[PDB]
């Protein structure tokens with residue numbers, strides 16, 4: 001059974017006891033210092049091809065909710081940018097706060113957002129997700145910030161079903177969801193090598209964090225907070241503040257796909 005979670009007694013500062021890689025050299029999330037994250041003209045444009053994405057179900061796993069996809073074919077794939085090869089979309093999930101002032105995992109010049117979306121993809125050369133997570137180039141995660149403002153129609157179908165998966169272990173059918181509705185206008189991004197942000201914290205991720213946030217209304221984010229960490233028949237623990245703090249960058253370089261206002265040359 002997992003001891004780990006987000007509370008005082010089992011949260012991120014405890015995770016290294018069961019997962020010593022928590023103190024590794026390539027841990028995520030990180031703060032993105034936009035001065036030092038330099039433009040790299042070697043990076044190719046990102047290709048986010050979700051027109052054939054096939055969603056299957058939505059699940060409360062006790063630490064977030066996941067929308068799962070059929071990853072048996074190259075329907076919904078991420079390619080280009082820093083990536084070698086083709087990465088299949090397997091699921092997306094979110095991290096959010098107890099209030100609108102926090103909840104993202106990555107920060108941008110120390111600024112937090114109300115929530116962060118992670119679209120998780122695995123490298124097709126390895127045959128399945130379980131194999132891919134064992135390899136440094138196994139996963140690519142597209143991270144997208146959520147900024148409070150106008151309601152986002154692309155999120156509404158997700159929010160509308162959350163009352164059916166309130167507690168850990170509950171799932172529901174969730175077909176025909178189009179993840180194209182969760183992408184901002186611009187695909188400008190930062191990229192760096194890192195890790196899963198939950199246990200087992202494996203250093204298997206090429207992170208691609210988009211510069212432009214997508215909108216979310218305060219009401220929409222509030223529905224995330226109605227989910228529960230606990231399972232049915234247990235005392236209620238609101239699912240809030242399911243984000244890991246930023247971790248030391250160590251010797252890594254964050255690269256920008258675009259010229260930022262803090263760059264010069």
Ligand SMILES: [Zn+2]
Nearest residue numbers: 093095118197
């Ligand atoms: Zn995540």
